[PDB]
Amino acid sequence: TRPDFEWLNEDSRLFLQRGYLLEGTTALERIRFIAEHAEHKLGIEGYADKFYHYMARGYFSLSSPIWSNFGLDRGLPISCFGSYIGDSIHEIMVTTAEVGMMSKIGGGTSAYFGDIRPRGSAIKSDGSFNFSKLFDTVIDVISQGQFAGYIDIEHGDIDEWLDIHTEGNPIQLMYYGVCVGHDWLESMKAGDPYKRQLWAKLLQRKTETGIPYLFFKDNANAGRPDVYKDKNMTVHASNLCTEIMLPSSNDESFVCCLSSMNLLYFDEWKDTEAPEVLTYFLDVVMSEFIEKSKDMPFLDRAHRFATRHRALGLGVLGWHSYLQANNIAFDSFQAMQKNNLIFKTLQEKTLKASQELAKRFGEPEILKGYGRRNTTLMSIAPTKSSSFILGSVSPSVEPFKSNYYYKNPFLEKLLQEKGLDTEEIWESILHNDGSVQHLEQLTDEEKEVFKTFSEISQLSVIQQAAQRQKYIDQGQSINIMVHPATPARDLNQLYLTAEELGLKSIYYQYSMSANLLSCS
Amino acid sequence: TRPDFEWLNEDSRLFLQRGYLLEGTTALERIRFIAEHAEHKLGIEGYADKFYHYMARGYFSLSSPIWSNFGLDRGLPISCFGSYIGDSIHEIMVTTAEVGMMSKIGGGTSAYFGDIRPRGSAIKSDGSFNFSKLFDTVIDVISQGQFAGYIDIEHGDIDEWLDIHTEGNPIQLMYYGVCVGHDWLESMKAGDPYKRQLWAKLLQRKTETGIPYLFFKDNANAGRPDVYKDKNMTVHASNLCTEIMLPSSNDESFVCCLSSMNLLYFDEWKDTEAPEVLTYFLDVVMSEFIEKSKDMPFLDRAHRFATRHRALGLGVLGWHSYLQANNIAFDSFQAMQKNNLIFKTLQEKTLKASQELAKRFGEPEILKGYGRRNTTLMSIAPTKSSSFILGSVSPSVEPFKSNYYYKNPFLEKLLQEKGLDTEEIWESILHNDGSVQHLEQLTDEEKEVFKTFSEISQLSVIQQAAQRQKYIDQGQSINIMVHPATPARDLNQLYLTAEELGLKSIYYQYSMSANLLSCS
Ligand SMILES: [Cl-]
Ligand SMILES: [Cl-]
Ligand SMILES: [Cl-]
Ligand SMILES: [Cl-]
Ligand SMILES: [Mg+2]
Ligand SMILES: [Mg+2]
Ligand SMILES: [Mg+2]
Ligand SMILES: [Mg+2]
Questions:
Q1: Which residue of B has its CA nearest to A129?
Q2: How far is B138 from chain A (nearest CA, A)?
Q3: A510 and A384 in contact (C-beta within 8 Å)?
Q4: Contact A252, A304 (CB under 8 A)
Q5: Ligand nearest to the CA of B152
Q6: CB distance A58 to A391 below 8 Å
Q7: What three-state secondary structure class fits A261?
Q8: CA dist., res. A170 & res. B5, Å (int)
Q9: Is A519 a residue of the active site?
Q10: Which of A89, A96, A137 sits opposite B104 (nearest CB)?
Q11: Helix A27-42 / helix A274-293 crossing angle, nearest 10 deg
């Protein structure tokens, strides 16, 4: 019934033309080229037509670097770049040049600052915040930039980092994350007054700005694949969007590529080879990064990482879409059942594919004897533009912001079956911030299915992330949305619950205009 | 009569202890070590005792990097570092990392920005001023920094550079110079209104701030040694202090080392081997830089330059001191006679020494078949601290600021012979900004000999620099001092005369508190 490329409507074509495609290349032409180029690099007969078919059915979203650069001379097809900053000017300049080159090329960058000695240390040093000014300037000066720096909450310079983005502060452009350990938080909860005041200030900053990001470093490291545990490959920090969980060091900067399965069609593709085909595709994308980076000035640490690890980040979008297509409320037991099923299925299929890839092409150095091609397979990145392109489905695992901001097609259908598909009804929804909770014509059950992100239990967001985390070898970009009237006490408990449940990170805390945190 | 090391008085010892010497090394111990280390590297018997003797007599000043680092593990013994910035992010990052590493190590840095495409060029670019923000931040963040950027007056972005240091401007820390060609200035003088307004603005900026530096690029290139002309090795820019005249390129960053002859004792050392010994010393200093830099991250372009060129910068101090010791007024025909004699003698002796060095050790690559060891031998750097250390003699070729600010020892002697060496007389001099022009007890002849920098013809400063330039293969750091009441018209003519007479640069325009420009 659904035509091939239904998703590729006039909105999507325009978006792609204006953003990603070279003048004189159409969207369809580009998809065919990508499919054929991948087949050629894999050496697998029939691969292109399989990949093309799955594209045609709307099962795959490809990352913007892949749309822009895959199979072409320009740019790189990677979606993150994470550097470790050693405690020396030499190593600071190495990272500076990486960030510069990547800010020109694009795909976001990040770095770990926590091993830089703090302000006042003998060399007297100016500390880690002082060096953050260099990266903030690099991205101010060079663009295609976006950069995130990570600092430990126990670091000598934490107070300086907590004023990033405040009025007049030197740092206005770069983002940051704070690495927070289990023992530190247990000391805070047990009553330590300094930790209690620092934590309070961090929460105040996050309400005011959305940031810092939180990196629960002990959850991240406890959740690493065995290979990284076996070889003491510590995850110091995450990436620009907080979903990546890969080790960086003096000799290696993590990189990864991404593309995403459209969960709207889970019941169509769950027993197909679509996830495996996408895994194969991401592996050839990494082969391209390796080939392109081998002679690229300043990218030697990333070239090394990609060569030895071959880390991939296959993600998802359309989670809320899938739930709505099945008349399931986001915060429900039935949603939790589907969450387990979907992510279990993806874990199994992507791992199987990585095992087959090692049989065909060999294990990279870090995985010799481990039996797969890729150190990691899955990560749940944000997908705002990618979701738009692919039929305006819901972003990643996030609830729809609202029903009308774009009209929710499942709400539309429901309104049509009730004869309520009228300008007056829709205008009422627009005037209520895309909510339907005001509408007396809808049952409570129907209202539940179409709650907005703001109306949904934020505890349910966290719990669902915790539930699926066991099936995801990297991480998940998890946003929450909180009313500005929310007591600090309630935010405090939500973040503490996040760490307790094993979440490796939290991304942005969004606000809205003037029980959702403590019940699900 | 004069004791050995008379110059090394308690002031000098304290200065050296506090600035340059490692805890537990005395000034004398350091001098002996430097002499012996140089002998060892030259393989020349008796060299150390010759070098030590000349140090003992007060004939030599050594640069602060040499005092700090020569023969030791730490740092580098070079006094400039000049990079060419190619029009690419890659080449911008190469230069960024050079400047970072050198800002930690010390010795000043500089770079040429003029081949960066201007704001609005297709890639649309943000231009050369945008990239200057990166270097300004590097030196804000890393210290031991000082940096000077050079831009051509005809460059698309010249208006942006001319607001450097103004209220709120992004650039407050780095210095800059403007490269001004002969044909451009002839177009300006012939009446071009745009050039006339731009030149007027530059002069306004220089009165207000002292800067930009002026680099007369056609004089600099016309004055290069034949070897650089023969091989099209363009001098794009000068260094932090405007005395260096060396080529930089995509593959080479200029470096040079310095030390200085004390002209107070010219009549003692003119027929000795002291200038030759100092030349030999500077060549072994460059051998140290080469050895140290060979495995230093990010310094490959400077290592290459030093290896192939072996450029040296032997300078002078105590010019005004020499004139005063001989009862010669700075602005006089007799001064001009001495200027010619001294600089002719130095040109001959340093070149002879470089020829002998090539016979002993070989010609470097750039000079194969040219018959000397070093592409350049002489440059007249500023010597404010070095002059203090060496008996408080006058700085470089500059007049003494004043007679009492430190008491002029020739004025003191003159006052003693007249019985005028009294607190009342000296206090009168202090109250008149170190001038003696008010004192009725002195003849006009005596007053002439002890005019302050501010009282001296600035045309004479320029003319003396022009006269000695024929004997100096690099350049000269030339400051002038101008009353704030001076009409723009008169400054205009002075700078135009500077270019007409063949000066390769001008450094700072100093001011003072409320015929000297047009007569000598
Ligand atoms: Cl990143
Ligand atoms: Cl494993
Ligand atoms: Cl320099
Ligand atoms: Cl020559
Ligand atoms: Mg083929
Ligand atoms: Mg650690
Ligand atoms: Mg020996
Ligand atoms: Mg040129």
A1: B141
A2: 6
A3: no
A4: yes
A5: 8
A6: yes
A7: strand
A8: 50
A9: no
A10: A89
A11: 80
What one-character DSSP code corresponds to residue B390? T
The answer to whether the beta carbons of residues A177 and A147 sit under 8 Å apart is no
Q: How far is A132 from chain B (nearest CA, A)?
A: 9
* Nearest Cα to Cα of residue B142 among A96, A150, A140, A171: A96
The experimental technique behind this entry is: X-ray
Q: Compute the distance between CA of residue A238 and CA of residue A211 in angstroms, rounded to an integer.
A: 14
- Ion ligand 2: protein residues whose beta carbon lies under 5 Å: A 225-227
A101 contact residues in B (CB cutoff 8 A) = 89-90, 93
The residue among B345, B374, B323, B327 whose CA lies nearest residue B261 is: B345
Whose atoms come closest to the Cα of B232: which ligand? 8
Q: Are strands A213-215 and A505-506 parallel, antiparallel or unpaired?
A: antiparallel
Tell me phi and psi for residue A451, to 5 degrees: -55, 140
Look at residue B176 and give its three-state secondary structure.
strand
Q: Which residue type, as a one-letter code, is found at position A206?
A: K
Verify whether the Cβ–Cβ distance A96 to B92 is below 8 Å: no
In B313-472, alpha helices (H): 319-325, 333-361, 384-389, 409-417, 423-431, 444-449, 458-469
The rounded distance, in Å, linking the Cα atoms of B427 and B415 is: 13
Residues paired with A315 in a beta bridge: A260
Residue ranges at the known binding site of B for Mg(2+): 40
User: What per-residue string of b and e applies to A175-211 under the rule 16 or more CB within 10 Å gives b?
Assistant: bbbbbbbeebbeebeeeeeebeebbeebbebbeeebb
Residue of B nearest to A139 (CA): B134
Smallest Cα distance from A29 to chain B, Å: 26
Angle at A295 between CA A290 and CA A296, to 5 degrees: 85
Q: Which residue has the tokens 């126990």?
A: A154
Contact B133 A141 (CB under 8 A): yes
The answer to whether B471 and B420 have CB atoms below 8 angstroms apart is: no
Find out whether A150 and A220 touch, Cβ atoms under 8 Å: no
Q: Which of A80, A179, A241, A257 is catalytic?
A: A241
Sequence-separated (6 or more) residues with CB below 8 Å from residue A109: A80, A81, A82, A83, A98, A99, A102, A103, A145, A146, A147, A148, A240
B282 vs B277: CA distance, rounded Å: 9
A100/B94 CB distance under 8 A:
no
Residue A240 CA to residue A258 CA, distance in Å, equals 14
B134/A141 touch (CB, cutoff 8 Å), yes or no: yes
Sequence letter at residue A126:
D
Count CA atoms within 13 Å of residue B47 on its CB side. 20
Sequence length of chain A is 520
Q: Which residue has the tokens 């450097």?
A: B164
Nearest to B297 among A90, A133, A134 (CB): A90
Side-chain-side CA neighbours of A453 within 13 Å: the count stands at 25
A40 labeled binding residue: yes
